[PDB]
């Protein structure tokens, strides 16, 4: 690790600076170094890790979609042949994206998940595992595609089972997990009815529990509930 010589606390401090400067690649590298110190992460530190990689891979996904669309148009009838360059460059971006996903999955497997015993940590890491397998599935076209999809499903499912047993229905991590697993069903698994059912039941069961919350918790939960509603509106 190039971060092996930097103090854990300094890595965390610099991750926060990198976030302020919108330097998400640096942020991710600092958080990878922090994870590799071997200690468990606090709630705030788990948020830093997830924000850094979500922004890095989100930019890669957006670029991959632009290039994939150009590549599809180049393969339509009446399109002038332009050579291998579009495919090559799409492949370059795809391979980088896969590398980032493999890095995150590697941190989760070595050894964040196995030491995560509380629901708030374990559900969040298993949600991340589902997310990064989902990003791998978005670009998969080969003989492991079904296994990649199933890996995402299995991680999400374990997170769901824990979240339903151990968290209230308004817990933001439970809500965000459900939001993303619902998207998995709709976009990856060819299961729009499951996606819709999950989003609706999650939203309704959260609504019924809002009365138990403080004003600040209510704000946190309703924010994610609105995302579930936005997806339901998109899908119906």
């Amino acid at each position: 690790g190039a971060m092996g010589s930097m103090e854990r606390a300094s890595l965390i401090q610099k991750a926060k600076l990198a976030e302020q400067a919108e330097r998400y690649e640096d942020m991710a590298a600092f958080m990878k170094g922090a994870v590799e110190k071997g200690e468990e992460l606090s709630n705030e530190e788990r948020c830093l890790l997830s924000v850094a990689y979500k922004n890095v891979v989100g930019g890669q996904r957006a670029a991959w979609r632009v290039l994939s669309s150009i590549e599809q148009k180049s393969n339509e009838e009446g399109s002038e042949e332009k050579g291998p360059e579009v495919r090559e460059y799409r492949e370059k971006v795809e391979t980088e994206l896969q590398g980032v996903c493999d890095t995150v999955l590697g941190l989760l497997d070595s050894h964040l998940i196995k030491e995560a015993g509380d629901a708030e940590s374990r559900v969040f890491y298993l949600k991340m595992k589902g997310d990064y397998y989902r990003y791998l599935a978005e670009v998969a076209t080969g003989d492991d595609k079904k296994r990649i999809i199933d890996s995402a499903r299995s991680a999400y499912q374990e997170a769901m089972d824990i979240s339903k047993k151990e968290m209230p229905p308004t817990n933001p991590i439970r809500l965000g997990l459900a939001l993303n697993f619902s998207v998995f069903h709709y976009e990856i698994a060819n299961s729009p009815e499951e996606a819709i059912s999950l989003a609706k039941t999650t939203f309704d069961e959260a609504m019924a529990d809002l009365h138990t919350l403080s004003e600040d918790s209510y704000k946190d939960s309703t924010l994610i509930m609105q995302l579930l509603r936005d997806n339901l509106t998109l899908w119906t």
Binding site: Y186, E187, L227, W235
Partner: peptide, 5 residues
Amino acid sequence: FPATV
């Protein structure tokens, strides 16, 4: 695209 967090 749909919303994810």
